[PDB]
């Protein structure tokens, strides 16, 4: 009678209540399947619910029972009414939590979910970066980099690419001065190891003067540190910088001719 009173409630959609009843009837059927055919299966045609929604409800059943593959198949089945953005978001987040990156990517590629919110963009780029679609991720980032969302997008990309190790791929793209400036600002205050990594990035973009300034800063910093692995790496680094700076253009040569 509680299910029945749902009909007595404010009906936003008869199809919603029909889908609830159909899901309950399917649960009844799978509780004890008797006979290979039933007139209860005739309920959706009796109450005139689209086969699109029928296949959808099948997908909802399968996803609830964690048959994600069959649920995705039923959802991606064509001639199906497109589902709503909230359940897009929950579906994709659950799939990523469960680790079904390929399935979530298939969902996104077929259904083509909407994205007009920073959260939507972050979720979609998360799926794409877990599935190695770095190029399209960066492209849509550039597209939707508003004056309000750009730094959030950058921070999210930095964290997630740090987690799954796409650094050399990322280093091979066209960029902008603001992006590199924000990168430098973020990485400058984030510890020594990030200092040597961004040193590597300077050298990768051929930034030798700045690399040497960072090296001077690190050497000045390491005058009270006493870790032996750090001492090994720092002696290596001192040999490195003595090798490099003397060959570079002459400004640092004049600075070396200057007393220290």
Residue 164 near residue 130 (C-beta atoms within 8 A)? yes
Cα separation, 192 vs 178, in Å, equals 23
DSSP state, residue 226: -
Residue 148 contacts other proteins per CB under 8 A: no
Segment interacting with other proteins, rule: CB under 8 A, options 12-20, 25-33, 62-70, 99-107:
99-107
Cβ(202)–Cβ(210) under 8 Å?
yes
3 state DSSP class of 131: coil
Work out whether 239 is an interface residue with other proteins (CB under 8 A).
yes
200 binds other proteins (CB under 8 A): yes
Which residue in the set 232, 253, 255, 256 belongs to the binding site for other proteins (CB under 8 A)?
232
Q: Is residue 243 a contact residue for other proteins (CB under 8 A)?
A: yes
209 vs 38: CA distance, rounded Å: 79
Candidates 15-23, 35-43, 178-186, 231-239; binding stretch for other proteins (CB under 8 A): 231-239
The three-class DSSP label of residue 172 is: coil
- Between CA 75 and CA 58 the distance in angstroms is 8
C-alpha 14/C-alpha 198 separation (Å) is 59
Integer Rg of the chain from CA? 29
The interface mask with other proteins, positions 3-32, x = CB under 8 A, is ------------------------------
The region of 61-69, 88-96, 178-186, 242-250 touching other proteins under the rule CB under 8 A is 242-250
- Contact between 41 and other proteins by CB under 8 A: the answer reads no
State which residue, 243 or 254, has the beta carbon closest to other proteins.
243
Unique residue bearing structure tokens 């996104």: 108
| Contacts for 145 with CB less than 8 Å, ≥ 6 apart | 153
Q: How far is the CB of 249 from other proteins (least distance, A)?
A: 5
> What is the Cα–Cα distance from 201 to 196, expressed in whole angstroms?
9
* By CB under 8 A, residue 58 contacts other proteins: no
User: At its nearest, how many Å lie between other proteins and the CB of residue 82?
Assistant: 8
If binding is defined by CB under 8 A, does position 143 make contact with other proteins?
Answer: yes
What SS3 class is residue 52? helix
226 sits near other proteins (criterion: CB under 8 A): no
- Give the footprint of other proteins on this chain (CB under 8 A): 50-51, 73, 76-79, 82, 102, 105-106, 109-110, 112, 114-116, 131, 133, 135-136, 138-139, 143-144, 146, 169, 172-174, 196, 200, 203-206, 228-230, 232-233, 236-237, 239-240, 242-244, 246-249
């Amino acid at each position: 009678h509680a299910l029945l009173d749902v009909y007595l409630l404010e009906n936003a959609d008869e199809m919603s209540k029909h889908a609830i009843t159909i899901y309950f009837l399917l649960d009844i059927m799978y509780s004890f399947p008797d006979k290979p055919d039933s007139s209860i299966e005739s309920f959706p045609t009796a109450f005139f619910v689209p086969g699109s929604l029928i296949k959808l409800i099948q997908g909802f059943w399968l996803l609830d029972h964690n048959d994600y593959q069959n649920s995705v198949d039923c959802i991606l089945n064509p001639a199906s009414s497109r589902v709503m953005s909230w359940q897009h978001s929950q579906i994709i987040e659950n799939l990523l939590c469960h680790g079904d990156s390929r399935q979530a990517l298939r969902y996104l590629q077929v259904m083509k979910p909407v994205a007009t919110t920073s959260k939507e963009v972050k979720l979609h780029m998360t799926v794409l970066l877990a599935n190695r679609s770095i190029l399209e991720a960066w492209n849509l980032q550039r597209l939707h980099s508003s004056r309000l969302n750009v730094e959030e997008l950058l921070k999210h990309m930095y964290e997630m690419c740090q987690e799954m190790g796409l650094i050399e791929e990322l280093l091979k793209l066209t960029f902008t001065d603001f992006e590199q400036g924000y990168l430098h600002k973020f990485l400058q205050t984030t510890g020594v190891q990030n200092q040597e990594l961004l040193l590597v990035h300077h050298l990768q973009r051929a930034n030798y003067i700045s690399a040497l300034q960072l090296n001077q800063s690190l050497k000045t910093n390491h005058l009270n540190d006493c870790d032996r692995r750090l001492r090994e790496r720092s002696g290596a680094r001192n040999a490195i910088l003595d090798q490099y700076g003397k060959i570079l253009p002459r400004v640092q040569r004049t600075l070396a001719s200057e007393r220290a």
